């Protein structure tokens, strides 16, 4: 987040930031393991008085008193009843909203961290840290403790946040293998939606297997994780002058200059401690490791042996998500790996030099879907496409508790920090939640469904090379089941031209269509609605999915989707269509004329056959304007639902 807001194009001059006053007049709630209040990110240097609308408390507890709140961290509350009920015999070490894990502090700062001067991750990603919404108000709701995390506590946290009058909810947690009426986050999310509060939730980190995501509910903004254009450097220079910008996250300014490099196939595997222990003068020599699919193990074996450094040959994506680099060294791709190994064989006295703590903001292509980001379709509900949108999630810099394990050097030295790099959809969601909040500040009347609409139909499915965003796991084009509508584009979302709006009643009608028992139904809708005589599964969503059974014979199928679009811009749009491979699509009308909040409907129809998830889209381009309302379309097999 010393660059993220720049990566999103946010700025003080124009766009969402100025339009929303950096979200100063809005409030976002963070449901996680609590917060570390005294962090610079949670101070209130440029904060105007607290909105009178707010009356949330600063609940006292262990090492936390009711004065721990300010005009930035305006609310603090924790929920442990679930843990005590489960066992009253438990001694809760940190019985308050104070964070003893880090997850909560990291998310909090990512969403609404104040400007923090001169921070970094041990020299990497240096600069000023700030949340996607630097002036948004923070309300911390801790339901996750070291002693345990309980569903009921989670639900109690949200209910309280919604009741407090929160504008937005951010939650980086997910559960899998359970039906809706057993899905805590979803149950509460429904309540939040019913009361005009959008919920941004991580998609999960168990990708890239099909339908591996969670929080894939129609009334939740499901977020996926992408890489940024940021990279961390261990510049590698050989004795022959060859210079290579490899990868490295060694947490210190190591000094490895003109050291002897060796390449010995008998150990180039870097998997034997016995072998590696046989390299004389291991403290002044650099050993080269071949690609064996397990870099992290190599790093371990190298760190144990105490080599001056190691040159790791690997292109495994997992390497570029981890900040675990306890020993000096660099990672290089297959080609570069050969250049290096060559130099060494064609020389006696082959040496090398590696510098550290270098961060570059030029990577291409970007963004890119994280190989571990959970993938749709939602096994909670195939009916609607998930995830919804993409956001920065790989190695994000944010606040962190100063008194907990951060990273490591050698085998015995643990390091701590105020700002650390962390990866996952946990880092992505808060980005969205913050943006969702600023949109809500710019358009106070917009509903949770409309705001999610502005973000989706305005998203960008192209990377910085202007090509289709790739899936890290395969390098092919990412699908909607990978990145939803695409990468968030705040400044555009501020002015979407059209929106696919929806109302609480619309979600009730959708809920009923699920055909649960009335007890199950009530389990989910609790008291926001009552068992609902107009079922409807065709929810007005800003995206389309076409499902096809995979049991038996496949046969040309046909689906029709009815949509209503309300003009938030007088203007007329023409529909541009790109049909998913092996299938046809048609809209009607094909044009939409607007006189001035006016609503207007249309119907999309797809003729497809199953075998494989193909993608297409439908964009409503303004004729006398520059508005473009895009919605992804994807075909999908019908997999086992929970």
């Amino acid at each position: 987040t010393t660059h993220t807001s720049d990566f999103l194009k946010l700025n003080p001059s124009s766009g969402l930031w100025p339009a929303s006053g950096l979200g100063q007049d809005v409030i976002v709630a963070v449901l996680d393991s609590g917060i570390w209040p005294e962090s610079a990110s949670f101070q209130d240097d440029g904060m105007p008085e607290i909105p009178k609308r707010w009356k949330g408390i600063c609940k006292p507890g262990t090492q936390f008193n009711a004065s721990m709140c300010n005009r930035k961290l305006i609310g603090a509350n924790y929920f442990n009843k679930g843990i005590l009920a489960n066992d009253p015999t438990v001694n809760i070490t940190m019985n308050s909203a104070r964070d003893t894990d880090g997850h909560g502090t990291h998310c909090a700062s990512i969403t609404a961290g104040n400007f923090a001067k001169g921070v970094s991750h041990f020299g990497y990603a240096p600069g000023t840290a700030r949340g996607v919404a630097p002036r948004a108000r923070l309300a911390v709701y801790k339901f996750s403790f070291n002693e345990g995390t309980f569903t009921s506590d989670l639900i109690a946290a949200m209910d309280q946040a919604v009741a407090d009058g929160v504008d937005m909810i951010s939650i980086s947690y997910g559960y899998r293998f359970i039906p809706l009426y057993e899905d805590a986050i979803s149950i509460a999310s429904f309540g939040a939606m019913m009361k005009g509060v959008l919920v941004s939730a991580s998609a999960g980190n168990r990708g890239p297997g099909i339908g591996s995501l969670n929080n894939g509910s129609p009334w939740i903004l499901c977020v996926a994780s992408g890489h940024t254009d940021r990279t961390f450097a261990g510049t590698l220079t050989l004795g022959n002058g060859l210079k290579i910008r490899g990868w490295s996250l060694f947490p210190a300014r190591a000094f490895v200059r003109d050291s002897p490099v060796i390449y010995n196939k008998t150990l180039s595997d870097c998997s034997s401690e016995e072998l590696l222990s046989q390299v004389e003068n291991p403290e002044n020599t650099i050993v080269i490791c071949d690609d064996n699919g397990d870099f992290s193990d190599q790093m371990r074996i190298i760190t144990r042996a105490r080599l001056k450094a190691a040159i790791f040959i690997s292109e495994d994506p997992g390497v570029f998500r981890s900040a675990t680099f306890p020993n000096p060294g660099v990672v290089v791709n297959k080609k570069e790996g050969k250049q290096v190994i060559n130099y060494v064989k064609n020389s006696v006295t082959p040496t090398a030099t590696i510098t550290f703590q270098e961060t570059y903001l030029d990577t291409k292509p970007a963004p890119v879907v994280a190989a571990s980001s959970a993938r749709g379709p939602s096994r909670s509900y195939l009916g609607i496409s998930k995830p919804d949108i993409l956001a920065p999630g790989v190695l994000i810099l944010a606040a962190y508790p100063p008194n907990v394990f951060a990273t490591s050097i050698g085998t015995n030295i643990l390091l701590s920090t105020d700002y650390i790099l962390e990866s996952g959809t946990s880092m992505a969601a808060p980005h969205a939640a913050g943006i969702a909040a600023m949109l809500k500040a710019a358009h106070p009347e917009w509903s949770p469904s409309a705001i999610r609409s502005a973000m989706m139909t305005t998203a960008d499915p192209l990377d910085n090379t202007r090509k289709p965003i790739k899936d890290s796991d395969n390098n092919k084009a990412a699908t909607p089941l990978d990145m939803g509508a695409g990468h968030v584009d705040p400044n555009r979302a501020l002015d979407p031209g059209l929106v696919y709006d929806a109302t609480p009643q619309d979600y009730v009608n959708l809920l009923c269509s699920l055909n649960f028992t009335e007890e199950q139904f009530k389990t989910i809708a609790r008291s926001s609605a009552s068992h609902c005589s107009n079922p409807s599964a065709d929810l007005n969503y800003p995206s389309f999915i076409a499902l096809y059974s995979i049991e038996g014979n496949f046969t040309l199928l046909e689906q029709k989707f009815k949509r209503t679009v309300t003009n938030v811009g007088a203007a007329t749009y023409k529909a541009k269509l790109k049909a998913p491979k092996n299938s046809t699509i048609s809209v009607s009308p094909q044009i939409l004329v607007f006189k001035n909040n006016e609503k207007q409907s249309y119907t999309l129809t797809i003729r497809y056959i199953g075998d494989s998830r193909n993608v297409g889209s439908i964009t409503w381009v303004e004729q006398n304007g520059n508005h473009s309302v895009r919605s992804p379309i994807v075909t999908s097999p019908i997999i086992e639902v929970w």
Partner: peptide, 4 residues
């Protein structure tokens, strides 16, 4: 549960 899983904290993502």
């Amino acid at each position: 549960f899983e904290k993502a």
